[PDB]
Amino acid sequence: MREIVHIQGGQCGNQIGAKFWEVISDEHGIDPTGTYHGDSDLQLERINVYYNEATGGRYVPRAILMDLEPGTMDSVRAGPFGQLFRPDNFVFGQTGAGNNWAKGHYTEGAELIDSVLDVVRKEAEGCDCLQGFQITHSLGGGTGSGMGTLLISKVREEYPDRIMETFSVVPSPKVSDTVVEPYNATLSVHQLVENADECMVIDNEALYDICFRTLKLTTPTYGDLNHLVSAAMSGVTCCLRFPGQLNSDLRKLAVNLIPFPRLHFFMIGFAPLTSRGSQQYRALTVPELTQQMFDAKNMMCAADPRHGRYLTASALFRGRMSTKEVDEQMLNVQNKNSSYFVEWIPNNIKSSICDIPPKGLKMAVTFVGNSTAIQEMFKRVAEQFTAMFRRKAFLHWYTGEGMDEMEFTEAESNMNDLVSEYQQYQDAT
Amino acid sequence: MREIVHIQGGQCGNQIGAKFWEVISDEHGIDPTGTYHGDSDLQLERINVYYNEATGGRYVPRAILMDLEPGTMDSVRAGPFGQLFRPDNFVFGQTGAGNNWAKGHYTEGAELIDSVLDVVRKEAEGCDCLQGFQITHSLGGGTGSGMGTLLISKVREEYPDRIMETFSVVPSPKVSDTVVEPYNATLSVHQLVENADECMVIDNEALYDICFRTLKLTTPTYGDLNHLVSAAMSGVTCCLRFPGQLNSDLRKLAVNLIPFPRLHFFMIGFAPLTSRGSQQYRALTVPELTQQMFDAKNMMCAADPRHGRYLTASALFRGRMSTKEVDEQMLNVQNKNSSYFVEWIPNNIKSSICDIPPKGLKMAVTFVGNSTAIQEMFKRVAEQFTAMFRRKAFLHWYTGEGMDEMEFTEAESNMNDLVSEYQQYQDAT
Amino acid sequence: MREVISIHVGQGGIQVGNACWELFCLEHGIQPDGQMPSDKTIGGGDDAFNTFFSETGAGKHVPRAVFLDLEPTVIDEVRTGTYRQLFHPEQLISGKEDAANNFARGHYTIGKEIVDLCLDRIRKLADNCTGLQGFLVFNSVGGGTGSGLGSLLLERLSVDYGKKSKLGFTIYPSPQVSTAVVEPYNSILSTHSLLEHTDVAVMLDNEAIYDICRRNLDIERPTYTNLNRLIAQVISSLTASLRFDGALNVDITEFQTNLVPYPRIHFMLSSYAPIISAEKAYHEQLSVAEITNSAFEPANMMAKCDPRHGKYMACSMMYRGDVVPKDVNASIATIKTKRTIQFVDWCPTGFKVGINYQPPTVVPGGDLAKVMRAVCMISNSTAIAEVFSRLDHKFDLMYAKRAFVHWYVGEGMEEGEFSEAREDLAALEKDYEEVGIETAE
Amino acid sequence: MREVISIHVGQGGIQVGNACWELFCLEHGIQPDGQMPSDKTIGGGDDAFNTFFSETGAGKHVPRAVFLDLEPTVIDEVRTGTYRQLFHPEQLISGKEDAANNFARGHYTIGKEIVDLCLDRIRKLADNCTGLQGFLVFNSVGGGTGSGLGSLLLERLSVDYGKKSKLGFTIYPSPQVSTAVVEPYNSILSTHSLLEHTDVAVMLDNEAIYDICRRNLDIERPTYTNLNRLIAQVISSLTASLRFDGALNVDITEFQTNLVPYPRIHFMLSSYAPIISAEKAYHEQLSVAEITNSAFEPANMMAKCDPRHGKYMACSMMYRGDVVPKDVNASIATIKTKRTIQFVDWCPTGFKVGINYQPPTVVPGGDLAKVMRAVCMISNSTAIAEVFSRLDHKFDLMYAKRAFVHWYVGEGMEEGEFSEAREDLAALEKDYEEVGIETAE
Ligand SMILES: [Mg+2]
Ligand SMILES: [Mg+2]
């Protein structure tokens, strides 16, 4: 039915989806137990395309658990809504990748892929007209990417018609949570540029910036952050989940978002984002949220539209309004800062609306535009990879996995090729 | 809509506007919470041109907070009606100007102007047909003037069409609340003669005189005083806020008040002013309040119409009466003391009426006439500046800011030029 | 946000400090251990204690001040005293062998010994602080480190931060009463090395404390307890703006180049009142005008230098409690009214009001009576140069006789420091000499 | 599932072990006999004690660690001590006649005597275990078996399993303080036979323990009780991830080829904090930034090798308790900020966060005060080669004089082991020599 599935690895991402399904449960108001306690059939109408009824009305996720060590499995296993799960999917590891990506990709990569792809495949038979599935990990290591690389390869072959919308955490330029990041990252991204269908960037520092400045929060954790992102990743299917006077699916999205298949790394904007007092400063209009939409500070990725140029831009609106406003602000904005709008893409802004906003708010905005400002991102990470690969720093942890360096060259001149590729598209008219 | 904004700095002025918006709230009878609890739509009809509805009907000010140290921000932040505010505008400083005006103008002047002019600019987009905005500080230091000088320059350039009606506190001739006053003052007034559109004089000693003699009060504070002045500054937009058989806006006012742009320092009269027993002495007539209108004791400024000559004179009437009276007293008075009426300005008195007086009273009077008696004001302050500038007294606090003295000459022969300028206009026929 | 921190040196000096933090802790009423008697409600609008009392994760709120002196006996009494829960060990730095009132010793000799520990502590606090405006430094030209080691202290601390304010409380050699005779050496050697390392500071003399506590407090037999209490009050009010709501919460940096208009002669007097008894608290009314007119009594002048012999320059009559802008204001007219008083006319008025709404709090066991209104006349005139002149003439002869010089030459100072420092008071004598000259025509 | 096991050798070494298992048993609070005070509820999500404390069919939960040393007196004290209900007989293997600090004796001579018993015990535990990640091995270059017999121990145990991690805690000859003079022989003879049998290990020196406990713990007169307590804390936190929820429950194997990027120079420093007193627990706040900035104090460096003389490579600031990713994160920016610090630039950043949510637990009778947050700076730099160089120069001359050599030649080692092992430190001197070279262009 255009239903989809979720698969998460990732040192964080395993938590991320926990929050995610948590949020969707709220938007479906079904008890933690797994039965519905809401007030409209509309939550039940399209419930299946994420959930699954069970005998007795156990309502369940179409999620897939990735992990190389059960702790997360216990963690979310210790999770509220944990009784809303299926014990089947608790597919984890006994070792951990140690985030040498070769470890999580050959060593443990080849070790535990099979049981996953089997049960996942059983989910594939459980899906009537599968629009797709949602993968989640991080692009700097192996706790997610280790195996998730193998996932994208295997299912991608196994389902060359299905959509692969991939969110994985990008290392911020400043803070290096690990120094093996350039290598895991580069080795992964070689794969992901080939095999993944959609990708959107996952920085932490942006999420900090949001929580601290625009959220005006002092205490950052993951969980709030995954609230902030699963807000958007939860919004994305809204029309696909719920009616909309102007609907567009991921196929309409990506096909209406990408000129050439190498450009499915997208940046993200969601809003509104206030602290409590703000409403008693300000109110909500479509033009208002628009005035956030093109905010670099909501630009939750390491790329700057202020520095790069919008190759593409789009808006995901959930609520009840007048599109006569919506479009009007659209075109207005597409003029107002025309210069950061790439040229030969006429009407490079594109529209949407969901008859219902997310719960709690009256109107919704989402922006997954695609400039080319990410070039500094790949340039950076490739740069650090370059330096220590001059040094071969921690190659020994690496070659101990029994990869070659020439692969590193492959993702290397590879990833540079993708960058310059974005250069010419940005530098053209 | 001819809506306007407020911006306040100033050791007092930050309090002043607090009282001001407080008063306007009363005249709009909206709860402190920010919703209307009044009895006529008329309060809601033109509410926007000062206020702003919010999502849910939070009704908010178009005010702008200036400060170089948050204490005031906490103060009014501790203010009744404080829940009627927007937390956004609480733009203050971490240092304080120390009232060396160069400190508040270069040092901290350049330090915090940006965040202000940005958010203010966001208010500029929030304004449909902005008649203007109201600034408030004092003309002797830097707690307001420090930055407010930069405000008038920046927005004045940024909005060369908007009205800049400026009220700032003038040091009384007798009591010197600080001795650096001539220098801050002179340096400011150089700017204000160039850049500000309207100005009205703000003495303290007049306000004392009003409270003690004509108010018959023994206990003076600021807050009552700002009641007395925000009474008038609140009256000014009445027609602009409410119907009037004889209406006149600030454009009609100033254009109908000023012969040449250097003359937008105006004196003020508001009334009635009694203590409680007085009503059981006297009653209200247009001729009565007229008989206060030309009272030097209501002449709330350091200039004497009894010594100078009315270059201009005007009346702001709110209530319900017969203009057949009003004019009649007008012309009557324009004869009765013709000598203090400048000559070649025929009908140098001018009229107005608002269908509603302010709350609590049945009839309103306001007088912002403009003689040229202020010459003693500038002559004094320039004189003290002259003396200690002979001494360079506290130049070291000053040049420590890294200004030049030649600027002091600039505002100096400047301000003298403006004085003599008023001399020739006064001495002419 | 608005921090200051106190530094304490010299025997009398840290005596003062002890009195002070006793005071403030009393005044916010946080119990000596470090807790408040009750929980603190969350609010905004202004700071609180946070200036000085140090927030913990619990009822532990230590001052932001530091002890430094090379005569470590007495400080131990704090190390023993009731507030041994109050203060904090690393708050405590002392020297064992003090200066023996060799300026040159704890300034030079032992000057080298504890400086780095001091600066590290300073970095810990200022790093702990954010909007620390300025520096409260206390010492004494008697408890010899109070001159010498403090001299290096500002000498370097200024060069560390600079942009902070220098809040200078040190004691000055009483005019005829004294403590030693090398005081000339301590003082002037301090002074030439004091000035250019000082921002501004006041000169507290004791004999006034005696005479006035005995007449105005009705004191029979006082000591450093009473003195330290009195300076405790004066500093208690000199900074209320950063602690309490007042109409014109003026600030130190605000005071700086406005009270002391020129850069040079940047010291002053300070006659606080109303200091009276419980039997004069009653039998009296204590008007604003009484504190005000009384504020300028030369006989009330809290440092033994006749104002009437000088010409005033500035007067920051910051007020505690129920003050009226008008009433004080007209009193200031009354101060313009005073024929006997004469002002640096090129600064005709330089006044600067302070009306803080909290009236004073009293320390139990004290001699001052309770009132509703406080005054601090931080004022600067021409008068104070004279007693300096006594200092340089006394020191002039004694130094001419080479008295004691062996003591200092023995510790690493040169003679041109002496004669040149006398040139220093020469120049400052030219300064009080010149600024008091009325500008011609 | 996630097991590790501890091995204990050398006098100081098993001293450390005793402190450690005292600690952990305290921290899970299982009573010394082997029971918990109360029943254990059935739950899931992560492991518990099960790592190390050994489940019985009843309240008997013994460590998963092993004692081995040829100097069997002191271990008997454990055989006697309060935990004689805790431990288990077959947990205990000792030698009677120790090495006399002949490396070659308990390594060669008595090396032959107890090995098989050791390996059998190891097979009993690892067979008892499932997901044992790595090996906790403790010994000492002093209590001579700690060098020799341990040298064979890893020499063969590595060849047994291999795939387990080598968790190396041994003590290093203090730079100027010592225990003997054959220490050169013990150490270097260990080292050439240490490296290729070691995965990674840290070097704890004592003099830091002294200086820092005496200043930071405010200790007057310490000993192995304090030392063993301190290392007890550091190991207490170096493995919390496998014991307690933390945001980034990093793992040993994770640490391995990431902290020590190359294979060779795979040792490191470790300055734990916050070690303060009860009187500094109060009078302080102990910020994340305080532990963090404080974490890199070279004077805080818990092994007597100046970091500022070296260039850092990695820093795994695993944290106990209420840690914020952001706050620490910006502190790490602050660490990038430190001009004095210099990093193996070809490894620009190699950082690896650890935020475990349990703040530290304190051992009663201890000197450390209680806090909310712990840091372990397992960091690797260029600096540490130098003290090695002292070791090979000292040993260089002494060996040149053939001092003591009769002792070792008497027990079955050859001279080329000596000169060649000096070639070993030659090579490692080339390693710290080379990896510190900045890659050209
Ligand atoms: Mg001393
Ligand atoms: Mg032994």
Author numbering:
A (entry chain B), B (entry chain B): 1 to 429
C (entry chain C), D (entry chain C): 1 to 441
The authors write:
Micrographs of the vitrified doublets were acquired and the density map of the doublet was reconstructed from the 8-nm non-overlapping segments by single particle analysis at 5.7 Å overall resolution. At the outer junction, where the tubulin from the B-tubule attaches to the tubulin from the A-tubule, the M-loop regions of our fitted tubulin models in the PF-B1 stick out from the density map. The M-loop of α-tubulin seems to adopt a different conformation while there is no observed density for the M-loop of β-tubulin. To account for the specific conformation of PF-B1, we performed further real space refinement of our tubulin model in the PF-B1 density. While interactions between tubulins in PFs-A10 and A11 are canonical lateral interactions mediated by the H1′-S2 and H2-S3 loops of tubulin in PF-A10 and the M-loop of the tubulin in PF-A11, the interactions between PF pairs-A10/B1 and A11/B1 are specific to the doublet. Our calculations show that the interfaces between pairs of α- and β- tubulins from PFs-A10 and B1 are relatively large (buried surface area of 688.6 Å2 and 462.1 Å2 for α- and β-tubulins, respectively). The interface between α- and β-tubulins from PFs-A11 and B1 are weaker with buried surface area of 351.7 and 137.5 Å2 for α- and β-tubulins, respectively. Using PDBePISA, an interface prediction server, these interactions are predicted to be mediated by electrostatic interactions involving residues R308 of α-tubulin of PF-B1 to E414 and E417 of PF-A10 and residue R306 of β-tubulin of PF-B1 to E410 of PF-A10. The M-loop of α-tubulin of PF-B1 is also predicted to interact with α-tubulin of PF-A11 through a salt bridge (H283 of PF-B1 to D306 of PF-A11). We also detected salt bridges between α-tubulins from PFs-B1 and A11 after the refinement of the tubulin model in the PF-B1 density. This conformational change in the M-loop of α-tubulin of PF-B1 is likely to be induced by the interactions with the PF-A11.
Conserved in both motile and primary cilia, the doublet is the elementary cytoskeleton of the cilium, comprising α- and β-tubulin heterodimers, forming a complete 13-protofilaments (PFs) A-tubule and an incomplete 10-PFs B-tubule. The outstanding stability of the doublet is likely linked to microtubule inner proteins (MIPs), which bind firmly to the inner wall of the doublet microtubule. In this study, we obtain high-resolution structures of multiple repeat units of the doublet by single particle cryo-electron microscopy (cryo-EM), reveal the remarkable interactions at the outer junction, and discover an inner sheath of MIPs inside the doublet. To structurally analyse the doublet, cilia were isolated from Tetrahymena thermophila and split into individual doublets using ATP treatment.
